[PDB]
């Protein structure tokens, strides 16, 4: 399950090899009343960029979106959907911004269409700046 | 080819013009900062060794 890739995949603040005679894992609460999920504590995964078990700090803005693509490795694309007002025609126009959000692997079952909440953090890659903090399931689909 | 010979134990110096290639080939093809025996410079120059220290060109 773990140690897929080239280097050893461990959490950097834990010292796992103290002399004996299950590893403890580092995890934190990210503030703003976000409940850390049970799979973050009970899991066995590693992640640099998970907000709950990694070296990121959720700051700034706390936005939302709908899951619209999950084709990437440990990041999804959300589709922020909003309106915009022209001062001439007292009307609106429906716009959107697709944006790439690092989805931690503690959110283990999510399908596209779910309304996730994201938080601004350190820029994790070129076009990724947010993390999925909590996931709210789409309407219906309880089965 | 003008020469500027300086004796630094008294602190004196003098420009001597000379145009004798027999007096000058003993100076030619030798590098800077070396002590060439100046005995081929005239009647009065015997036992004098001089460190050549580099000068100025035809064009300055």
């Amino acid at each position: 399950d773990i140690q897929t890739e080239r280097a050893y995949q461990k959490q950097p603040t834990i010292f796992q090899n103290k002399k004996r005679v299950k590893l403890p894992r580092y995890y934190k609460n990210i503030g703003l009343g976000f409940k850390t999920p049970k799979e973050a504590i009970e899991g066995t995964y590693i992640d640099k960029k998970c907000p709950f078990t990694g070296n990121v700090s959720i700051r700034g803005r706390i936005l939302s979106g709908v899951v619209t693509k999950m084709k990437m490795q440990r990041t999804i694309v959300i589709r922020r959907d909003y309106l915009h007002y022209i001062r001439k025609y007292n009307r609106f126009e429906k716009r959107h911004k697709n944006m790439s959000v690092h989805l931690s692997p503690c959110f283990r079952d999510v399908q596209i269409g779910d309304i996730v909440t994201v938080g601004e953090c350190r820029p994790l890659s070129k076009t990724v700046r947010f993390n999925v903090l909590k996931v709210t399931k789409a309407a219906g689909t309880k089965k | 080819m003008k020469l500027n010979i300086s004796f630094p134990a008294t602190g004196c110096q003098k420009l001597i013009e000379v145009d004798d290639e027999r007096k000058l080939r003993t100076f030619y093809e030798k590098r800077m900062a070396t002590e060439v025996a100046a005995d081929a410079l005239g009647e009065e120059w015997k036992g004098y060794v001089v460190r050549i220290s580099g000068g100025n060109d035809k064009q300055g």
């Binding site: 503030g31 703003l32 009343g33 700051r59 700034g60 706390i62 | -």
Partner: protein, 262 residues
């Protein structure tokens, strides 16, 4: 720009200095110091526009460099020194003491002070730091690093500093009921009692404060400077005492007082 700017323009200067428009292209870029640039009032502006003790930049230079102006108990000689909030000017020779407190509007007011009040000032702390051997540190609003404070002094409180020593004498804690001078924003200069404190995690915490005449108004917490327990201050208050009478009441007061003057 390829580095830090050194010039400041006349129009781009802050409005509460109340510079005019047609003397020169520039305004004095204040030197770096304990108070911010847009929240200071420099010594050239204080001696030249307000007090009229100097007429020109040469006159305020020769006043400040025959060593007469004593800011905060210390001799400060450059004319672009940022004299900021709660600073104490000690005019030694002419025998005055000023405290740069704000006005009922956005100004700094010329506010004459007795020497027994002018030997202290009041400072809002900005940080609690812990130095290298468990040594606590206050960081006030005017760059004072004060090592070994009282552990009951926390991050948004104020302290009464003795000036020739720099030591703490007493402190007021940020609670509901205490006073407040407001150092920033649209409510700048107002004086009231702290009615409410509203916590916003991540955002800027906002404090509701109510003055003497029943007017309640909000302000971000970075702009709030408590100045005494209850209604009783630990300094003096300027003329008008931070009320902000309306424009109708100001009109009525000026015509009433000057028709009584005649």
């Amino acid at each position: 720009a390829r580095g830090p700017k050194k010039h400041l323009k006349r129009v781009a200067a802050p409005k509460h200095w109340m510079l005019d428009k047609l003397t020169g292209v520039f305004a004095p870029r204040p030197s770096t110091g304990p108070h911010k640039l847009r929240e200071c009032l420099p010594l050239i502006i204080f001696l030249r526009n307000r007090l009229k003790y100097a007429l020109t930049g040469d006159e305020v230079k020769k006043i400040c460099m025959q060593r007469f102006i004593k800011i905060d108990g210390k001799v400060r000689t450059d004319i672009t020194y940022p004299a900021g909030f709660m600073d104490v000017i000690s005019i030694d020779k002419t025998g005055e003491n000023f405290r740069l407190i704000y006005d009922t509007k956005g100004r700094f007011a010329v506010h004459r002070i007795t020497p027994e009040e002018a030997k202290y000032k009041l400072c809002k702390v900005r940080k609690i730091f812990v130095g290298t051997k468990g040594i606590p540190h206050l960081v006030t609003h005017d760059a004072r690093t004060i090592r070994y404070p009282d552990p009951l002094i926390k991050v948004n409180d104020t302290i009464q500093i003795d000036l020739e020593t720099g030591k703490i004498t007493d402190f007021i804690k940020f609670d509901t009921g205490n006073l407040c001078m407001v150092t920033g924003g649209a409510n700048l200069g107002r004086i009231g009692v702290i009615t409410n404190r509203e916590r916003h995690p991540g955002s800027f915490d906002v404090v509701h404060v109510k003055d003497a005449n029943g007017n309640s108004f909000a302000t971000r917490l970075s702009n709030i400077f408590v100045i005494g327990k209850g209604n009783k201050p630990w300094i003096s208050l300027p003329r008008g005492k931070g009320i902000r009478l309306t424009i109708a009441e100001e009109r009525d007061k000026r015509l009433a007082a000057k028709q009584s003057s005649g």
